């Protein structure tokens, strides 16, 4: 302890994006490691934000955050209770729910939001932090199966990323991979209706 020397955790910092605006998905880095560490400390990020899916970092982890209905959502297991860096300084979470593994901040100016799905469709697509678009069959409210299994390395750092309907509506937020002996066959996600409930409380 000793209060005079106690440290503060830094802000979550946007360090890039998954670009989905064209015919090709690809990852873009907007901030390297030294700038990220500085921005984490001040909570002041003057970078212009664009797009729906951000790549975010703390001091110890890198993962995704997805804008839906003007809220930038990610996983509690990545972000904890942290603020996010913004042009005006650190921004406090608007939503925090450890039970859902969910947090949200006001979507950054410049971001674009995905629309919540209304199709009731079960043919889905998971966007990874490396900008891979993996097909996923919905198997329950919060479960989908990967049409082609991958090692868990392949999904590491994609928590907070979106599951999309063929149209491109947001169906959910990737939470955790279900694996056996290191191979991911299934995914757990936070369905968008759970977000929408949270957005009414
Ligand atoms: C491989 C990619 C994968 C998506 C990733 N998710 C995880 O690694 C989660 C985090 C943690 C364990 N995870 C797992 O995926 C494990 C693992 C063996 C690692 C594959 N699998 C697993 O549990 O399967 C069991 C069926 C589910 C039942 C148990 C699910 C419990 C979910 C969960 N809830 C809470 C609530 C509150 C918390 O407070 C701190 C913490 C939590 N942590 C949790 O799970 C990811 O990319 N992360 S990340 O981006 O690298 C990182 C920066 C954030
Ligand atoms: Zn839809």
Residue numbers in the entry: 981 to 1181
Publication excerpt:
The HCV NS3/4A protease – a chymotrypsin-like serine protease – is a prime therapeutic target that cleaves four known sites along the virally encoded polyprotein. In this study, we report that four chemically representative protease inhibitors – telaprevir, danoprevir, vaniprevir and MK-5172 – exhibit distinct susceptibilities to the protease variants R155K, A156T and D168A. To elucidate the underlying mechanism by which chemically diverse inhibitors bind to the wild-type protease and drug-resistant variants, crystal structures were determined for 16 inhibitor-protease complexes. These complexes include wild-type protease and resistant variants R155K, D168A and A156T each bound to telaprevir, danoprevir, vaniprevir and MK-5172, with resolutions ranging from 1.10–2.50 Å; S139A protease variants were used except for telaprevir, which requires covalent bond formation with the serine 139 for efficient binding.
A156T, the worst of the resistance mutations for MK-5172A, sterically clashed with the P2–P4 macrocycle and caused a large shift in the binding position away from the catalytic triad relative to its wild-type structure. This altered binding of MK-5172 resulted in fewer van der Waals contacts with D81 and R155, and is likely responsible for 1000-fold lower potency against the A156T variant. Overall, analysis of the four crystal structures explains MK-5172's significantly retained potency against R155K and D168A as well as its loss of potency against the A156T variant due to the rigidity of the macrocycle. Similarly, vaniprevir and MK-5172 exhibit significantly lower potency against the A156T variant due to direct steric clashes, while danoprevir partially accommodates this steric burden by repacking against the mutated surface. However, drugs such as vaniprevir and MK-5172 containing P2–P4 cyclization likely select for the A156T variant due to the rigidity of their P2 moieties.
